[PDB]
Design a protein around this ligand. Structure first.
Ligand code: CA
Ligand code: CA
Lengths: 51, 51, 48, 78, 51
């Protein structure tokens, strides 16, 4: 099944952290996880544009 | 006129089509919408104006 | 990109319009000729 | 090799849509798109030479031979 | 499901939640003309196949 690719998110960088810039016309699943001992894993159904 | 490649066809899959919708504007407060389609309306086969 | 004024111009009938929509194009991967234009939805809409 | 479409790779060295093997179009550099599947040789736009060979229907009785039996130029058949 | 023959014109309905669904991680109204291909499942329209 063909599925869309949400616009490639722009990223901003800062001391020990980043800010993703997200732009999706429709509900798009975002997820992230750390590769450390803890997962700190999170997910969010981002909508529209946000950071 | 011409023929294009609209995302969804009569059948639920991509196809080439004479009535490929290009763009759609809905800025009018009336809720009406302008539709730009590959097919031409109001022109004769030879291109005579005929609504 | 995506902020107000993502596109700007001297006036509506000017040819010196600039922008920073962050438009990017992927490879035309599908069999049919198509251009995968993708971008931040207009900052004008976000501001609206 | 492992690839995202989960579908056959031909001598082109790329994974390709296996449904294109009977889409009516040869996509791989090899004539694989007609090797392993049932096909309508003639669409409603096409003329069946009486042997079952298929050519664009406009090729029938147009002036020159097309299929291996010449049905595309058969006077009686025109 | 219904018969519309005027005379034989009965019908039937059943309560069944049938919301739109979308394989992948992005909500999409229609399969996008372009994008990534992902493994999905569909009902094979070939009448001979056996479920
Ligand atoms: Ca093919
Ligand atoms: Ca001929």
């Amino acid at each position: 099944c063909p599925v869309p690719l949400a616009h490639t998110p722009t990223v901003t960088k800062w001391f020990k952290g980043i800010t993703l810039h997200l732009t999706a016309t429709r509900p798009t699943l975002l997820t992230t996880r750390k590769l450390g001992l803890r997962a700190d894993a999170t997910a969010e159904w981002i909508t529209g544009t946000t950071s | 006129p011409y023929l294009g490649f609209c995302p969804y066809c009569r059948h639920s899959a991509p196809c080439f089509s004479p009535i490929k919708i290009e763009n759609v504007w809905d800025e009018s407060d009336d809720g009406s919408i302008r539709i730009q389609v590959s097919a031409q309306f109001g022109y004769n086969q030879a291109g005579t104006a005929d609504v | 990109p995506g902020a107000f004024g993502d596109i700007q111009a001297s006036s509506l009938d000017a040819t010196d319009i600039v922008a920073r929509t962050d438009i990017r194009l992927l490879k035309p991967s599908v069999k049919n000729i198509h251009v995968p234009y993708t971008q931040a939805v207009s900052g004008y809409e976000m501001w609206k | 090799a492992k690839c995202e479409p989960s579908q056959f790779q031909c001598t082109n060295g790329r994974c390709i849509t296996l449904l294109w093997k009977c889409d009516g179009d040869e996509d791989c550099v090899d004539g694989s798109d007609e090797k392993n599947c049932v096909k309508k040789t003639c669409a409603e736009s096409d003329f069946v030479c009486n042997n079952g060979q298929c050519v664009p229907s406009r090729w029938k009785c147009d002036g020159d031979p097309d299929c291996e039996d010449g049905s595309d130029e058969s006077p009686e058949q025109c | 499901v219904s018969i519309t023959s005027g005379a034989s014109e009965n019908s039937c309905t059943v309560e069944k939640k049938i919301r739109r669904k979308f394989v992948g991680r992005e909500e999409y109204l229609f399969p996008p003309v372009q994008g990534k291909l992902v493994k999905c499942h569909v009902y094979d329209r070939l009448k001979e196949t056996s479920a």
